[PDB]
Amino acid sequence: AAGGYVALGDSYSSGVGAGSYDSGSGDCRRTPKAYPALWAAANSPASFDFVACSGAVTSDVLNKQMGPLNSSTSLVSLTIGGNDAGFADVMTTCVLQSEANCIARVNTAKAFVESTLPGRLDSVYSQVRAKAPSANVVVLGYPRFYKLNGTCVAGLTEGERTAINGAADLLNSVISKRAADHGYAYGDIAAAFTGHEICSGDSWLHSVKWTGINDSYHPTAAGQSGGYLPVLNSKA
């Protein structure tokens, strides 16, 4: 692959949930099992800079991750926006509080996604293009977290799962539209993960964690290699 590959983003790109984190990345938790590393190993780009970081928000991408982008960059991947909208806080609320509290918190997040996130995404997307004029940029969306089925243990109430899935749909809608607006490819992770959500019976996502590292709602190693990687392969 001609040109450098720069992998930007949050925990869904660093690989939280896939295991084997490189200690040198600290709390960013990047791993060779994450789709950017899998893609780079198979495609041999001129250079590979993996700067995604667990917990990253749009301002972090602008402040800490733009350095490797340059005129020789030919491919850029990115997952970002979920944390700006506070989805980790939303999930904590939905797990530890009542269904009513969950809905209210989800609705506050959805309002932010519609009114505030677009502007932040435009800012990140425009700066990426400014620093890497020639790169093909692939913005990957997020998966839906749940399969709505007959009473699922620990999987939350149906009403909460519905609300959370609805929030993912709205987030992915905003991202897909912003990506198209900038001529960027949109990676449909929700489509790729259909039939592999929590409660699906063949999940590629971690359920809520009560012990260990918190990789709740994140892709497993199978989700990274079977879901994210093929999506990037299709758009790179």
Side-chain angles (χ1 to χ4, degrees):
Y5 168 36
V6 177
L8 310 169
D10 55 26
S11 56
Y12 287 73
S13 290
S14 74
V16 170
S20 296
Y21 306 115
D22 188 289
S23 195
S25 68
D27 289 3
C28 283
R29 287 197 172 75
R30 286 183 289 273
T31 159
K33 298 195 163 191
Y35 76 82
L38 298 176
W39 188 90
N43 296 275
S44 310
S47 60
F48 173 45
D49 293 296
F50 194 0
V51 293
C53 190
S54 178
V57 290
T58 56
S59 65
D60 294 332
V61 175
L62 291 166
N63 288 317
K64 301 204 64 179
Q65 305 186 20
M66 309 284 251
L69 298 172
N70 55 61
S71 65
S72 65
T73 304
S74 65
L75 178 63
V76 174
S77 54
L78 170 73
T79 53
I80 198 71
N83 294 308
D84 284 70
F87 281 119
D89 185 59
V90 168
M91 298 321 285
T92 298
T93 296
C94 291
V95 168
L96 302 174
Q97 308 189 357
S98 79
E99 187 168 324
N101 294 316
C102 175
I103 303 307
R105 183 71 188 74
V106 166
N107 288 339
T108 291
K110 294 175 74 180
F112 173 95
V113 165
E114 298 172 59
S115 74
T116 307
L117 184 61
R120 301 194 180 176
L121 292 180
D122 274 331
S123 177
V124 174
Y125 293 13
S126 288
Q127 290 301 315
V128 164
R129 175 55 75 215
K131 212 161 179 297
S134 307
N136 173 38
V137 181
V138 180
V139 180
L140 295 86
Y142 297 97
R144 272 180 166 177
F145 290 167
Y146 295 98
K147 185 63 185 177
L148 312 173
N149 67 0
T151 298
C152 176
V153 166
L156 296 228
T157 70
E158 168 180 294
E160 291 174 313
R161 291 185 215 170
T162 295
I164 291 164
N165 275 358
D169 288 347
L170 180 70
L171 176 60
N172 285 330
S173 174
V174 166
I175 290 166
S176 57
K177 291 173 176 182
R178 216 89 310 281
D181 244 53
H182 291 254
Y184 295 173
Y186 170 69
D188 197 339
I189 290 295
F193 273 65
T194 295
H196 296 291
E197 303 96 333
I198 295 163
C199 300
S200 68
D202 188 29
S203 183
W204 280 350
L205 297 171
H206 289 280
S207 53
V208 179
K209 298 293 186 179
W210 303 83
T211 340
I213 295 295
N214 185 185
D215 54 8
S216 302
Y217 302 106
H218 281 67
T220 54
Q224 284 290 336
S225 66
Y228 278 79
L229 181 59
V231 169
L232 176 61
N233 287 342
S234 79
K235 301 296 190 184

